Amino acid sequence: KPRVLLAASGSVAAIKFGNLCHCFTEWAEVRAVVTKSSLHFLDKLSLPQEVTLYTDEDEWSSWNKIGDPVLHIELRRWADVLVIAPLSANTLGKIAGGLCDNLLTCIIRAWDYTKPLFVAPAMNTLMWNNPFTERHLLSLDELGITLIPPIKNGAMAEPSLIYSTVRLFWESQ
Amino acid sequence: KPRVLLAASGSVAAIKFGNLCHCFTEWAEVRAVVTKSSLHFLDKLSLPQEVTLYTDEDEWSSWNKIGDPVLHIELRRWADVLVIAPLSANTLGKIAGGLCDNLLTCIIRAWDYTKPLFVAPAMNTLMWNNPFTERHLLSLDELGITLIPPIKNGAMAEPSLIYSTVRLFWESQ
Amino acid sequence: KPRVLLAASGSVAAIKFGNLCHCFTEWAEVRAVVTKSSLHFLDKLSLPQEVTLYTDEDEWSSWNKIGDPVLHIELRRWADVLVIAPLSANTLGKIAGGLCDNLLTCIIRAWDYTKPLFVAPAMNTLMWNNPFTERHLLSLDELGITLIPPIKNGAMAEPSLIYSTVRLFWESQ
Ligand SMILES: Cc1cc2nc3c(=O)[nH]c(=O)nc-3n(C[C@H](O)[C@H](O)[C@H](O)COP(=O)(O)O)c2cc1C
Numbered sequence: 001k002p003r004v005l006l007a008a009s010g011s012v013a014a015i016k017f018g019n020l021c022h023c024f025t026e027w028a029e030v031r032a033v034v035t036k037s038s039l040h041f042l043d044k045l046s047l048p049q050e051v052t053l054y055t056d057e058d059e060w061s062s063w064n065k066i067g068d069p070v071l072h073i074e075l076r077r078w079a080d081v082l083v084i085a086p087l088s089a090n091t092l093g094k095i096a097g098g099l100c101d102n103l104l105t106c107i108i109r110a111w112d113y114t115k116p117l118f119v120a121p122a123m124n125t126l127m128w129n130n131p132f133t134e135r136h137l138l139s140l141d142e143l144g145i146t147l148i149p150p151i152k153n154g155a156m157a158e159p160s161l162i163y164s165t166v167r168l169f170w171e172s173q
Numbered sequence: 174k175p176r177v178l179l180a181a182s183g184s185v186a187a188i189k190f191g192n193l194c195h196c197f198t199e200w201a202e203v204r205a206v207v208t209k210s211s212l213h214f215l216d217k218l219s220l221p222q223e224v225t226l227y228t229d230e231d232e233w234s235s236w237n238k239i240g241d242p243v244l245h246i247e248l249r250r251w252a253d254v255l256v257i258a259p260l261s262a263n264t265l266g267k268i269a270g271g272l273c274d275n276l277l278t279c280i281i282r283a284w285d286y287t288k289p290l291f292v293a294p295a296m297n298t299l300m301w302n303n304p305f306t307e308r309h310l311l312s313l314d315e316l317g318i319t320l321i322p323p324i325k326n327g328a329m330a331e332p333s334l335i336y337s338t339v340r341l342f343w344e345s346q
Numbered sequence: 347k348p349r350v351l352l353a354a355s356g357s358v359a360a361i362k363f364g365n366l367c368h369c370f371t372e373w374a375e376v377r378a379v380v381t382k383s384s385l386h387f388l389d390k391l392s393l394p395q396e397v398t399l400y401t402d403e404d405e406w407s408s409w410n411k412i413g414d415p416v417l418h419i420e421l422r423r424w425a426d427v428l429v430i431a432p433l434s435a436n437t438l439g440k441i442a443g444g445l446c447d448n449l450l451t452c453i454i455r456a457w458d459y460t461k462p463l464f465v466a467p468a469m470n471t472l473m474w475n476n477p478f479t480e481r482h483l484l485s486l487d488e489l490g491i492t493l494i495p496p497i498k499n500g501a502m503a504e505p506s507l508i509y510s511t512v513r514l515f516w517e518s519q
Pocket residue numbers: 008009010011012013035036037038087088089090091092122123124127232233236243273274275279
């Protein structure tokens with residue numbers, strides 16, 4: 001059973017993150033990662049009971065002294081695939097900038113692109129049409145990241161599409 | 174009467190932001206946006222009484238649940254022009270990076286460059302002469318942003334120049 | 347006696363920062379700069395008693411009103427050389443992005459590359475092998491920064507090597 005890491009960043013579409021997790025739970029073992037901002041839009045009670053939710057604070061529950069496991073490193077090794085849905089314009093920019101100041105971006109900055117990484121951008125039309133969207137998505141493409149396009153613009157792809165896109169890929173490999 | 178959005182970021186020159194707003198109030202309808210760091214140098218009592226000042230917290234006064242208006246989107250649509258004076262080296266870098274973690278940078282990341290956007294950089298000479306200044310300003314130029322050059326170096330352009338530069342442009346269009 | 351600014355950013359290797367300072371104290375006048383995250387791994391009591399340690403808060407102890415000295419500017423002028431050991435992946439990215447949101451990155455964003463700046467990256471192997479490492483280090487190289495390579499991968503270079511590398515350079519100039 002594939003290990004799928006699902007992540008949410010600060011887009012209003014994170015309100016659908018619980019449902020997205022539900023779409024993956026039967027087929028895969030699911031763990032969730034959220035940014036602080038995503039918590040403004042996500043209700044934890046909407047998530048499957050079996051899914052462990054990790055936040056920035058969890059980095060310090062795992063590590064306390066030298067030698068201990070570093071959570072972003074353990075999740076990166078554990079995952080067969082990472083799906084960021086929603087991917088906010090800010091996190092999109094931080095990924096393109098190679099920055100890492102929280103659990104999600106640390107996992108990504110430690111990423112080995114031999115492993116599949118999918119993103120479902122979700123942002124207002126004005127940010128979607130702004131020039132940095134095409135610039136950063138182009139950079140993510142070069143890295144090997146797979147874009148699950150928003151719905152026409154910038155609204156997050158539907159959970160069912162995110163799920164079937166990842167499932168079809170896995171079964172083909 | 175043109176709608177002018179005036180913004181201040183974390184430079185000591187933000188102490189002059191109130192006066193800058195005063196220069197624009199008769200000619201335009203003015204709204205102000207400040208970053209958290211700019212508040213170290215700006216005195217709110219120096220602003221025109223008629224000017225509404227928006228901060229990061231205001232994003233949450235406008236939005237509470239799905240469907241509500243998102244402040245950075247409403248200000249971006251409302252504005253005929255955006256003027257950032259002072260523009261700090263940090264915000265300059267975030268703009269060039271397509272990042273958005275506060276009200277000001279969210280407005281900019283949602284910007285449609287068909288609308289004029291002027292910047293008045295303000296930083297110590299050492300930061301002004303540092304290589305990233307020319308690199309980021311070059312990127313802003315390509316986007317279509319209009320630079321109001323600092324005074325010789327890196328001291329913010331005088332409010333009167335910022336004002337006449339924006340006014341002359343508007344009247345020509 | 348050369349003025350050496352030693353800095354630590356958020357890597358576990360910062361636990362060795364006190365010892366690194368000790369390596370430099372006899373030969374140079376040493377001042378230390380730390381990021382907030384580095385404080386998770388550094389024990390202040392491990393530092394030489396004679397070394398003043400500066401943090402982000404110190405920026406506000408030095409400056410209170412217009413005209414006062416700005417600490418990152420004073421340290422940049424004071425230093426003959428800057429050594430960042432450890433350099434985290436995040437600070438590496440912020441340097442390459444020309445960003446400055448804390449004392450360390452403000453000093454760097456104000457840097458005049460005629461003065462030597464050495465970096466000793468320290469990060470988990472997964473981050474070291476990630477594509478942004480080579481990309482950002484390449485950018486730092488172009489600026490004139492001198493890389494003191496990690497030990498095979500990504501573990502920080504030993505303090506003795508960091509010290510002799512800086513000392514040999516100085517004595518040659
Ligand atoms: C009410 C509101 C709704 C937002 N909606 C979105 C959105 O749909 N997509 C997006 O990319 N950013 C959106 N933003 C801006 C992000 O929340 C902001 O850039 C944030 O810093 C991103 O944090 P993160 O990327 O670390 O999760 C919104 C902001 C607010 C206040």
